[PDB]
Amino acid sequence: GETTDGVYRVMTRRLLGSTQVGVGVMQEGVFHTMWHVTKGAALRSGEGRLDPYWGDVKQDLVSYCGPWKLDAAWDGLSEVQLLAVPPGERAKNIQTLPGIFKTKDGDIGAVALDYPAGTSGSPILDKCGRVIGLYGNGVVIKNGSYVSAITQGKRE
């Protein structure tokens, strides 16, 4: 299969036509996505098979072929870019200043950008192009708009 680094669409042929259920990042031979996109199922890349390696429903993350590789973090000050990959649409970078999700266990960055459900797994990047987290797990605020957490795993 294609192991080249980059952003990939996660597709299915189970439903009507070819449907995009999410997005992910290939880095250092490992495919990273959100748990709710694949529910931990195996993936296909051409003729090759990608088997899950690590996952966690609470963090809402999963890695394939190896351990989670992404460890860059939002610095808490600078603007970032959502590299949105919407269903049937070209990859597009959107710049934004993240807000904050304050929890009983600490704070996390959050991006107030609204996209179709099948955009889950799109990477959020810093100015060096490093992936600081994935887009697609968050909350709906008073005005009905969507705010996603900047979800990052841990590199062992």
């Binding site: 299969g1 294609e2 080249t4 680094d5 980059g6 952003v7 990939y8 669409r9 996660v10 597709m11 299915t12 042929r13 259920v21 997005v23 992910g24 990042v25 880095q27 495919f31 694949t38 199922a41 195996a42 993936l43 296909r44 890349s45 990608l50 870019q81 590299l83 990959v85 990859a91 970078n93 990477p123 990047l125 810093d126 100015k127 060096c128 192009g129 992936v131």
Partner: peptide, 11 residues
């Protein structure tokens, strides 16, 4: 499920 390349990760 299957994956398709959609681009490079660049600012």
């Amino acid at each position: 499920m299957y994956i398709e390349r959609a681009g490079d990760i660049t600012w």
